[PDB]
């Protein structure tokens, strides 16, 4: 219905633009590029000639390894194309994959754009364990000047406090977040499913908005509950230096009381954690398989450093035993393959 | 002919009940008291709907493949050893919850299979009806007022 | 031998004239059990207890008894390839006995003979029997009788 | 029409209702095979309900309404009666037999016997009517059974808090369970049967050695005998929890005693071969570990 | 058509009344009933079976044993054999022919079955794995006059 | 520590070793001794443990101890996954014994309900003992969810330090000494994982198995050390070279299981020759040689003489040869050199093991072989031989082993257990003066041998679903006569004596 607010030739193109503008936000980057290239093929194969189809099919077969041929580009079609072929001869894949996206000429909807545009009270942003969409909500709820409850789903008392805050916050109208809904899914199907599955009235639509944090890798959420709520995937990956500043910023909250050398050791631990986390994303190259690393490893490594520094003289000696301890107990615990060790 | 209502979207089992009123018994092949209550129902002449069609219980075959040993005064059917009298007014419906459920070939060749299953090809039917609703309100008005005034 | 090579007819003729070798016929299929074999034997056979031979199983008379176990290579083996009934028959030849598992005592067999009959293992659905079993038998081949003799 | 043909068979069936009755050890007679009659009752109730959709029954109804009103109360008494049966038969094997367990709980058994008498009255009187349907005409039967199962439930609730408090006194009893603890409490006078459970509530030791007056020590599952320093006294006015708690602390103190004694001997230049035949394994292991790390600290 | 032609021949008809819960024990009672009628009552029954009725392979194994011979030993095992023997003695002696030893009467029995029992298999779709197993079974295949009532 | 360069490696090594100190000024005797490792401390509890079995100290065992004390230092629950057979619970129990604690093990899903599990959790939460959840992945989803909730309450009460916690809606005190450990069998989508609620409260470890040189050296140190390092190196190199040159056969198993068997066979043979390399050579030729084929026997000989040549002529070369020839003559057999060789081989092998496996083609002569050896023994030793022959796959497991009835508890012994009962309880007849030969002549599979696996283990016990353990005497020996090992595990093969009739 949104498409309205050569007639066929216009409304069809604006429909392709509307489909990519709306459903791409609920998909990850890989499926975003799959949908962009595909839909582009479904639009261009019917309008243009067969030569255009044959050229695009042979270029996709050169990006893949199905069939590799280098036909004539077409005649005087160099302006329309030859750029993906130019990206092919240079063996560059990011520009060639983003060319199909630049072709849509669609402002890629940010999570702020979907939350502002859509008129619904339930949203679920599932993501990998690498990142968390909470920090995005911190700025987005502050920009909307709402509030942002962060109700952690912990024990039975946490569950009771969660349902109490839900039943009050919907009346007050403040935004709430439910971190890690996957672990309390058993409680979800009993209470939360029945609670938010059926819409009640406009009383909650005017003020109240609810958010749920899920994880892509993990248990499957119920189908009626997932269909009722809008879906987003927070896929914003921060930089290495940015993660270093984020880890360094957290250190002076609690404070350091051991000594000045412990500060230097903590700085080294922050760089080490950011570099392992940087190597984590690269699964085929680098780490043999994908290992998930949390801040608990940062905590255990920090406590081991304070324990060894509190009982040892200021000489350069403990660097012999700290390294093995980290690579075998703190971080080498999850790793099973010796190559990654 | 026994209708077989294939609607995953449960709804038919309500419209039927809203039509026939209080005399709609609802049954199931998985309710293990089924056989005696079904026997009882046909003796009473109730309307019956049976849930979970992707199951069948061959004893019911004589209701499906119409057969009734004729009597003079009455009309009787062996639902097992139970030589049951048919109260005339009886009506059997079967329902089923999913097309991935297999239909035994015995049923599938006697019973009137009907699908209420939502079909994507409703996009093809409906989006034109909305395209014209935003293209020409007056002609889509004429398209309906012609036949209804007629 | 192939299907219809007078495999049974030859046995039946040879032994019908004879007064010494009576016949039991046991036609196997996909899932025959050893209990079926013992149930077949029960009508013709008798059991006697002896300390020296534990439970002797003679036949219920003075003759000899031939178990014609037809289609012996069809019983469906388990996934490891073990077809337990062929092993049981191996036990009957090689060991002259078997274990009686409700009693947990050994049974020695007295005068019972085994005859197999089979259609070649290359035919559809046939199972290659264990060599450890087949090693005990004098295998013969029969073929169709040349057309002219027919 | 067929309405009559069905009511006839229903009434025919219900004028033949018999219950299998068999008497257990004490005077009371238990009833066997509840499910047949109950299932028939429920089946006939659904048929009587379904008889309301017919058209040829309007004038033909009143009789069937009386029949329905009878069968509904029949099922009402059915449920409560089977529940009473089950709960009494369960509490009987716990309280109706032992003398020590009822000496510990005089009130609940004092009530149990008073319940058993009335139950005997009702059951005998009910069985001798010779028609299971006519039982509903016996006065005060539904309310009787209602208050009887209420009293049984109260007794059974009481029967569990005493055990839970006994578990709170000695937390090893959590491993045992209800049945074994009941035998330990009843058989506390005899004192030998507790030894079988000792492997469960300890895990290391196997049996307890006696000298018919006191506990000299205990032996493990391997066969090694442990001798206690302080012998445990036994008297008539004692509970299992008391001497069991004293035993629990005493074995730990005796382990420490032989450990410091072993360490003192090993410090006094002794052979390991003479010590092994005299002290337990655990003491010589720890004393050897302490002396080994002590000598290797200066060796470093 | 089979019921019609049975009616023409004055055969009794049998159709097993099996459903979602009938088991081997029940199908065993059916067959013992049928065989007793065919022999003791001489009733000449056309036993009509459809593939839908053999919802497990044990029924098919039994039908192989039946058509391969003219009996199921398991149906007449133990004390039931002795009872059966008594009935047959009585039966034979009721007809005035006298046989003494068990073998003679059992041969008579089996021959009477072999002439008084007619089994008819309908099969709706040959390509079903069960149907394929019934066609491929040698005990069935080497007895049944296969006829195609195709389409 | 002696081989370290300076004090730096010595202190690095000493930090990892468990140090047992004592407090002199304690006056709190039960709390006197404490254990220091890598800087963390742990109080020794004076709980009686009896005489428990001790694991071989290996580097990976100390790494597992370091992971446990590291998690306990921060009051975190311990848990480690890995393939089965690496000693997860044995490590946890050994960790408890080292501190004088009896770890209560909870066996799960083996028709194990949830009521009694909660009763054990409340009791261990009061006593302050240590609980280990052995193989936690095999659980039902409803029971696993409720138990995981209870574990979450326990660990959160430990981390925060609450004295009283609400478990089973029951208020109960919490002693600070309780700890919970979770061992995880390997999954089927990969390695099994924990539920999401428990991930932020436990510390996962990758537990596997060790290599071979170190353990080989340690065992050689036990048996008599002379040249422990060189002998271990030569044995490992010899096994690697055998795996290198010998044909790729299915039943070939040259892993650590095989070398532990070779060393356990070397132990009683040292008493015959001495703590030299010659004993190792003879053990290898007793164990490995009968399992190799004609094509591989010469490979074995060549590589053996290559890496180390020790002796030339064996003992017991003639009285047994005579008795065998007499036995074969009584049977009317021709005493071929191959038959003689295999008879003597089998005769020697059966001296130190009870589970024999004889493999070959149908008609090889294996049954004649073992019966002739039995008769020869009956002559030479003067002991009797009782033989039972069980064509086991004709029987069901239930007809062989026992079972439970419909509701009655009465136990059907099953054939193999009933005969074992007779072999032990009888105490009338010369079974103690007899060799008892129970032959399982059939193709063997995993399911049946799994139901009796503890007989192949060093336990030498038949374990039964009935909960009873039947210790087997030395008189009892078992022969799996068969023609193939395709569906047999290496775990079983390495506990048996294998004889390949080439
Ligand atoms: N020592 C011997 N001297 C002469 N002939 C022998 C000797 N040993 C075996 N044979 C012959 O080889 C035959 C086959 O060996 P055997 O009977 O032991 O079969 P098997 O190896 O046990 O095979 P299966 O696996 O089939 O049981 C014997 O029947 C015998 O005739
Ligand atoms: N009548 C008859 C009959 C004959 C004939 C025959 C041939 C030669 C002679 Cl001298 C006399 C008669 C009439 C042509 N062949 N024939 C068989 O081949 C049989 O073979 C079997 C047996 C069991 C399983 C399978 Br599969 C096949 C069984 N019966 C017969
Ligand atoms: Mg053999």
From Swiss-Prot, chain A:
Annotated region described as AAA 6, given as residue ranges: 97-307
Subcellular locations according to the entry: Cytoplasm, Cytoskeleton
Miscellaneous note of the record: Present with 195 molecules/cell in log phase SD medium.
Function: Cytoplasmic dynein acts as a motor for the intracellular retrograde motility of vesicles and organelles along microtubules. Dynein has ATPase activity; the force-producing power stroke is thought to occur on release of ADP. Required to maintain uniform nuclear distribution in hyphae. May play an important role in the proper orientation of the mitotic spindle into the budding daughter cell yeast. Probably required for normal progression of the cell cycle.
Assigned protein family: Belongs to the dynein heavy chain family.
Domain note: Dynein heavy chains probably consist of an N-terminal stem (which binds cargo and interacts with other dynein components), and the head or motor domain. The motor contains six tandemly-linked AAA domains in the head, which form a ring. A stalk-like structure (formed by two of the coiled coil domains) protrudes between AAA 4 and AAA 5 and terminates in a microtubule-binding site. A seventh domain may also contribute to this ring; it is not clear whether the N-terminus or the C-terminus forms this extra domain.
Subunit structure: The dynein complex consists of at least two heavy chains and a number of intermediate and light chains. Interacts with DYN3.
Protein name in the entry: Dynein heavy chain, cytoplasmic
Source species: Saccharomyces cerevisiae (strain ATCC 204508 / S288c)
């Amino acid at each position: 219905k949104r498409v309205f607010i050569t007639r066929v030739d216009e409304i069809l193109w604006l429909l392709y633009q509307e489909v990519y503008c709306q459903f791409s936000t609920a998909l990850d980057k890989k499926f975003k590029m799959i949908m962009a290239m595909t839909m582009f093929c479904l639009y261009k194969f019917d309008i243009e000639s067969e030569q255009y189809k044959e050229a695009v099919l042979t270029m996709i077969g050169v990006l893949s390894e199905s069939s590799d041929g280098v036909p004539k580009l077409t005649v005087d079609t160099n302006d329309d194309l030859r750029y993906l072929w130019d990206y092919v001869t240079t063996k560059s894949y990011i520009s060639a994959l983003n060319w199909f996206k630049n072709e849509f000429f669609v402002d890629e909807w940010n999570i702020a754009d979907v939350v502002a545009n859509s008129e619904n009270n339930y949203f679920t942003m599932a993501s990998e364990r690498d990142v968390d969409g909470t920090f995005k909500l911190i700025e987005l709820a502050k920009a909307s000047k709402e509030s942002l409850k962060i109700i952690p789903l912990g024990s039975i008392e946490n569950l009771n406090y969660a349902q109490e805050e839900i039943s009050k916050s919907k009346i007050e109208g403040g935004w709430i977040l439910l971190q890690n809904i996957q672990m309390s899914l058993s409680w979800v199907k009993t209470y939360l499913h029945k609670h938010v599955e059926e819409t009640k009235a406009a009383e909650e639509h005017e003020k109240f908005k609810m958010f749920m944090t899920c994880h892509l890798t993990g248990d499957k959420l119920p189908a009626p509950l997932l269909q009722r709520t809008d879906r987003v995937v927070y896929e914003d990956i921060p930089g290495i230096l940015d993660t270093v500043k984020d880890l360094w910023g957290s250190q002076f909250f609690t404070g350091k009381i051991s000594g000045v050398w412990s500060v230097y050791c903590t700085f080294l631990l922050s760089w080490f954690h950011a570099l392992i986390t940087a190597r984590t994303r690269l699964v085929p190259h680098g780490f043999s398989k994908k290992y998930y690393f949390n801040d608990c490893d940062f905590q255990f490594a920090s406590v081991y450093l304070e324990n060894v520094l509190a009982t040892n003289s200021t000489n350069n000696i403990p660097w012999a035993q700290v390294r093995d301890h980290i690579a075998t107990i703190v971080y080498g615990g999850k790793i099973d393959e010796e190559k990654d060790l | 002919a026994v209708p077989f209502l294939l609607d995953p979207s449960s709804h038919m089992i309500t419209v039927i009940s809203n039509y026939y009123g209080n005399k709609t018994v609802l049954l199931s092949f998985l309710e293990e008291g089924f056989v005696k209550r079904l026997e009882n129902a046909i003796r009473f002449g109730s309307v019956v709907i049976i849930q979970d069609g992707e199951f069948f219980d061959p004893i019911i075959s004589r209701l499906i493949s119409r057969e009734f040993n004729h009597a003079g005064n009455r009309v009787t059917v062996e639902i097992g050893d139970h030589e049951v009298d048919v109260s005339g007014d009886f009506k059997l419906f079967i329902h089923s919850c999913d097309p991935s459920g297999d239909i035994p070939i015995f049923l599938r060749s006697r019973v009137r299979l009907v699908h209420f299953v939502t079909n994507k090809e409703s996009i093809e039917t409906r989006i034109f009806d909305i395209t014209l609703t935003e293209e020409n309100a007056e002609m889509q008005r004429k398209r309906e007022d012609l036949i209804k005034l007629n | 031998g192939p299907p219809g090579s007078g495999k049974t007819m030859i046995m039946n003729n040879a032994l019908r004239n004879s007064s010494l070798y009576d016949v039991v016929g046991i036609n196997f299929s996909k899932d025959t059990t050893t209990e079926h074999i013992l149930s077949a034997l029960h009508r013709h056979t008798n059991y006697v207890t002896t300390s020296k031979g534990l439970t002797l199983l003679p036949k219920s008379d003075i003759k000899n008894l031939v178990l014609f176990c037809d289609e012996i290579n069809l019983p469906k083996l388990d996934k490891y390839g073990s077809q337990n009934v062929v092993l049981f028959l191996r036990q009957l030849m090689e060991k002259q006995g078997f274990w009686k598992t409700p009693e947990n005592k050994w049974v020695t067999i007295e005068r019972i003979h085994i005859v197999g009959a089979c259609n070649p293992p290359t035919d559809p659905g046939r199972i290659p029997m264990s060599e450890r079993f087949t090693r005990h038998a004098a295998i013969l081949y029969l073929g169709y009788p040349s057309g002219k003799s027919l | 029409f067929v309405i009559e043909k069905s009511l006839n068979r229903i009434k025919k069936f219900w004028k033949e209702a018999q219950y299998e009755v068999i008497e257990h050890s004490s005077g009371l007679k238990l009833v066997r095979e509840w499910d047949v009659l109950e299932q028939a009752c429920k089946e006939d109730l659904e048929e009587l309900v379904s008889m309301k959709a017919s058209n040829y029954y309007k004038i033909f109804e009143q009789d069937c309404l009386d029949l329905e009103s009878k069968l509904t109360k029949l099922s009402e008494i059915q449920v409560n009666w089977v529940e009473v049966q089950f709960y009494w038969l369960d509490l009987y094997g716990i309280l109706g037999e032992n003398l020590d367990i009822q000496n510990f709980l005089p009130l609940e058994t004092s009530k149990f016997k008073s319940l058993t008498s009335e139950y005997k009255m009702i059951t005998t009187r009910a069985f001798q009517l010779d028609t299971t349907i006519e039982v509903i005409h016996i006065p005060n039967f539904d309310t009787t059974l209602k208050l009887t199962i209420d009293s049984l439930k109260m007794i059974k609730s009481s029967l569990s808090t005493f055990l839970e408090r006994q578990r709170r006194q000695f937390p090893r009893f959590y491993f045992l369970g209800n049945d074994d603890l009941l035998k330990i409490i009843g058989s506390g006078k005899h004192h030998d049967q507790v030894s079988k459970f000792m492997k469960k509530m300890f895990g290391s030791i196997e049996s307890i050695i006696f000298l018919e007056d006191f506990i000299t020590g205990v032996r493990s599952v391997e066969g090694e005998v442990l001798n206690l320093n302080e012998k445990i006294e036994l008297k008539d006015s004692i509970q299992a929890q008391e001497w069991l708690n004293i035993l629990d602390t005493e074995i730990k103190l005796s382990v420490f005693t032989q450990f410091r004694d072993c360490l003192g001997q090993l410090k006094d230049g002794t052979d390991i071969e003479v010590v092994v035949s005299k002290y337990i394994f655990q003491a010589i292991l720890l004393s050897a570990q302490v002396m080994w790390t002590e000598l290797v600290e200066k060796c470093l | 058509l089979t019921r019609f032609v049975a009616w023409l021949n004055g055969l009794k008809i049998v159709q097993p009344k099996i459903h979602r819960h009938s088991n081997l024990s029940d199908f065993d009672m059916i067959l013992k009933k049928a065989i007793s009628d065919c022999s003791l009552k001489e009733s000449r029954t056309c036993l009509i079976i459809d593939e839908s009725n053999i919802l497990e392979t044990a029924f098919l194994e039994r039908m192989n044993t039946l058509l391969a011979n003219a009996d199921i030993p398991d149906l007449f095992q133990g004390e039931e054999y002795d009872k059966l023997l008594n009935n047959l003695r009585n039966k034979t002696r009721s007809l005035g022919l006298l046989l003494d030893t068990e073998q003679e009467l059992y041969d008579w029995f089996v021959g009477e079955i072999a002439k008084n029992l007619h089994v008819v298999f309908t099969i709706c779709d040959p390509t079903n794995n069960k149907s394929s197993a019934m066609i491929s079974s040698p005990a069935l295949f080497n007895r049944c006059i296969i006829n195609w009532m195709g389409d | 520590l002696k081989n370290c360069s300076t004090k730096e490696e010595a202190r690095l090594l000493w930090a990892k070793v468990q140090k047992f100190y004592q407090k002199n000024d304690t006056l709190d005797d039960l709390n006197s001794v404490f254990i220091s490792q890598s800087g963390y401390l742990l109080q020794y509890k004076f709980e009686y443990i009896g005489i428990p079995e001790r694991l071989i100290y290996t580097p990976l065992l100390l790494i597992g101890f370091a992971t446990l004390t590291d998690s306990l230092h921060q009051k975190y629950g311990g848990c480690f996954f890995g393939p089965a057979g690496t000693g997860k619970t044995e490590t946890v129990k050994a960790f408890g014994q080292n501190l004088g604690r009896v770890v209560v093990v909870f066996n799960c899903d083996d028709s194990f309900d949830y009521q009694v599990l909660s009763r054990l959790l409340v009791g261990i939460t009061q006593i302050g003992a240590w609980g280990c959840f052995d193989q936690f992945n095999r659980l039902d989803e409803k029971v696993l969810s409720a138990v995981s909730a209870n574990i979450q309450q326990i660990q959160n009460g430990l981390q925060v330090g609450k004295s009283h916690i609400t478990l089973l809606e029951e208020e109960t005190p919490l002693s600070p000494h309780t700890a919970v450990f979770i061992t995880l069998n390997p999954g089927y989508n990969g390695r099994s994982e924990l539920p999401e609620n428990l991930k932020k409260s436990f510390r996962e470890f990758s537990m596997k198995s060790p290599q071979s040189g170190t353990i080989a050296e340690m065992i050689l140190q036990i048996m008599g050390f002379e040249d422990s390092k060189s002998l271990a190196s030569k044995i490992v190199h010899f096994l690697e070279l055998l795996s290198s040159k010998c044909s790729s056969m299915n039943h070939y198993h040259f892993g650590l299981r095989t070398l532990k068997g070779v060393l356990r066979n070397c132990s009683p043979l040292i008493s015959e020759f001495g703590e030299g390399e010659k004993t190792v050579v003879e053990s290898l030729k007793r164990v490995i040689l009968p399992s190799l084929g004609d094509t591989d026997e010469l490979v074995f000989k060549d590589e053996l003489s290559k890496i180390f040549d020790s002796a030339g002529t064996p003992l017991n070369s003639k009285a047994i040869v005579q008795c065998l020839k007499d036995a074969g003559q009584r049977s009317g057999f021709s005493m071929s050199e191959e038959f003689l060789k295999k008879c003597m081989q089998f005769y020697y092998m059966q001296k130190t093991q009870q589970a024999l496996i004889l493999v070959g083609k149908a008609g090889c002569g294996k049954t004649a072989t073992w019966k002739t050896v039995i008769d020869a023994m009956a002559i030479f030793d003067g002991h009797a031989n009782v033989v039972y022959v069980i064509d086991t796959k004709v029987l069901t497991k239930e007809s062989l082993y026992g079972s439970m009835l419909k509701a009655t508890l009465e136990w059907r012994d099953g054939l193999f257990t009933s005969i074992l009962r007779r072999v032990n309880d009888d105490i009338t007849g010369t079974f103690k003066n007899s060799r008892i030969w129970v032959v399982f002549d059939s193709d063997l599979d995993p399911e049946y041998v799994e139901a009796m696996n503890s007989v192949l283990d060093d336990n030498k016990i038949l374990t039964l679903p009935n909960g009873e353990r039947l210790p087997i005497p030395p008189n009892f020996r078992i022969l799996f006569e068969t023609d193939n090992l395709d569906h047999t595990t290496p775990a079983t093969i390495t506990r048996c004596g294998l004889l390949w009739f080439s």
